[PDB]
Design a protein around this nucleic acid. Structure first.
Ligand SMILES: CO[C@@H]1[C@H](O)[C@H](n2cnc3c(=O)nc(N)[nH]c32)O[C@H]1COP(=O)(O)OP(=O)(O)OP(=O)(O)O
Ligand SMILES: [Zn+2]
Ligand SMILES: [Zn+2]
Ligand SMILES: [Zn+2]
Lengths: 44, 67, 49, 257, 48
RNA sequence: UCAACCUCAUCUG
């Protein structure tokens, strides 16, 4: 999938079985990024 | 965290009055006089503005996850 | 004034703004029920928790 | 054996408030009219939210809650709009709902106050009572809020978001003459605004044959419905409830026969 | 039912595996009960 | 058609 970097906030695409290191910053904490499917919230 | 829309007890909209409350406090108005100027009459509505702690400003200091 | 009938409550009632706290204990975390569920290996009796 | 003929005298009428007096009426009727003010007057408010992107500090359901609480002008078309359950079409359509959109991004350095003004409605008659503004969220630079919302007809019995009124002040017997409230020390008690007593007299003399009448109302509008039309719609809705009850009662009596 | 000689231990009863279950983790490993380890110690000393 | 045991600490009436 596409993981957003923890520090430089740049999306990087990491394949499976690949080390979790952002290109151009090297930070080792990525975030999965919001899903395309949309969830309905009742305003209640 | 942010000023609630509508007073809990009655439901009068108090969400539009926080920025005006802060501005009137900056002017010189006492908290009670500012609350009176904003039109808050019942102590239920005055509790909303008087006791509100605006943490959204502290949370906005942290950088966003996605830029 | 009584909400259901509108009649004034005879005894005047103490009302005021008091600070209340919501404790972490909530019923949704505590409700539990069991019916022929999982069973321990050693005792072969219903599990714990 | 028949209903009394009530009388209304409107003392104050302002865009935010209606102060009126109903005389020659029962306490039950008056209380239930107030009750219908609060809970059974239809209004328009957001009940469906779909957030495409929310990078704000507040989570998605927090934003949805605040959006639901925002009042929406419902003066005329709330009577025209149908309930979603009644509407034949699946989900929501122009007849059963009103669509709003929010697309705000804080490109500038200064904090962007997302307000109710940023909500844009597909139908001009419903607007978020903007004509300050209700603050939905504050956006730091690089934070964005995008959402689509649908607002439906409903009354406050479902959810307090559909309350058309802020505070309904109801008072009867301003000077205690029916002794419905028995003061332990009458003198310590402040006089009512509607009180006709002299300052020396704390309470009116007990009236043994009296009945609660001459009820005083102060109905404050939330801005969605005009304060006059809140009262009119409440009376009409109570009358409609009674007529539906009578129709079902007649059908069941015929069935029993 | 009970002779005094029978009190002295000449034959040690080894409880069934039901008494001493093997605690399985993820299929990767099988820990053994404390009784199994103690019986292993007893068997080692007896063989020695 | 379906997941470990110990241990300790923290809370609950
Ligand atoms: C009234 O007696 C009860 C019971 O005996 C049972 N109980 C509670 N703790 C224990 C415990 O440690 N061990 C055992 N065996 N039983 C226990 O709890 C007792 C009271 O305790 P409390 O005095 O705090 O009750 P408040 O007076 O405080 O009630 P508030 O106003 O908060 O509702
Ligand atoms: Zn990075
Ligand atoms: Zn209030
Ligand atoms: Zn429809």
């Amino acid at each position: 999938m596409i993981y957003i970097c923890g520090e430089c906030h740049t999306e990087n695409e990491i394949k499976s079985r690949d080390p979790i290191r952002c290109r151009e910053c090297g930070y080792r904490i990525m975030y999965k990024k919001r899903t395309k499917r949309l969830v309905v919230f009742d305003a209640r | 965290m942010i000023i609630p829309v509508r007073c809990f007890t009655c439901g009068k909209i108090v969400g539009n009055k926080w920025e005006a409350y802060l501005g009137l406090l900056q002017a010189e108005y006492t908290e009670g006089d500012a609350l009176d100027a904003l039109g808050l009459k019942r102590y239920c509505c005055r509790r909303m503005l008087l006791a509100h702690v605006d943490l959204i400003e502290k949370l906005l200091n942290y950088a966003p996850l996605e830029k | 004034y009584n909400g259901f009938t509108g009649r004034k409550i005879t005894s005047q009632i103490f009302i005021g703004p008091t600070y209340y706290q919501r404790l972490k204990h909530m019923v949704d975390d505590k409700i539990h029920s069991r019916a022929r569920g999982p069973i321990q290996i050693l005792n072969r009796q219903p599990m714990e928790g | 054996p028949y209903a009394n003929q009530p009388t209304v005298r409107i003392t104050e009428l302002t865009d935010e408030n209606v102060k009126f007096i109903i005389e020659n009426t029962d306490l039950a009727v008056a209380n239930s009219i107030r009750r219908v003010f609060i809970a059974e007057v239809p209004i328009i408010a957001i009940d469906w939210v779909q957030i495409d992107a929310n990078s704000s500090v507040l989570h998605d359901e927090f934003i949805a809650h605040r959006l639901g609480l925002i009042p929406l002008t419902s003066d005329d078309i709330v009577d025209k709009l149908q309930y979603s359950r009644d509407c034949t079409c699946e989900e929501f359509c122009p007849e059963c709902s009103v669509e709003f959109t929010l697309d705000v991004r804080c490109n500038e350095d200064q904090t962007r106050h997302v307000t109710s003004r940023d909500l844009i409605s597909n139908s001009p008659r419903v607007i978020p009572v903007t004509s300050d503004d209700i603050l939905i969220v504050k956006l730091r630079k690089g934070q964005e809020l995008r959402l689509r919302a649908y607002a439906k007809k409903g009354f406050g019995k479902e959810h307090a978001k559909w309350n058309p009124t802020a505070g309904v002040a109801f008072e009867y017997d301003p000077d205690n003459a029916l002794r419905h409230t028995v003061y332990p020390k009458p003198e310590e008690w402040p006089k009512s605004e509607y009180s006709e007593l002299d300052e020396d007299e704390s309470q009116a003399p007990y009236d043994p044959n009296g009945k609660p009448e001459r009820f005083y109302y102060n109905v404050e509008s939330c801005g969605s419905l005009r304060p006059e039309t809140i009262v009119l719609s409440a009376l009409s809705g109570l009358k409609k409830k009674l007529s539906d009850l009578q129709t079902q009662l007649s059908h069941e009596i015929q069935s029993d026969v | 039912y009970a002779r005094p000689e029978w009190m002295i231990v000449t034959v040690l009863p080894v409880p069934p595996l039901s008494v001493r279950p093997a605690v399985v983790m993820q299929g990767s490993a099988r820990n053994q009960d404390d009784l199994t380890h103690k019986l292993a110690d007893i068997v080692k000393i007896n063989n020695q």
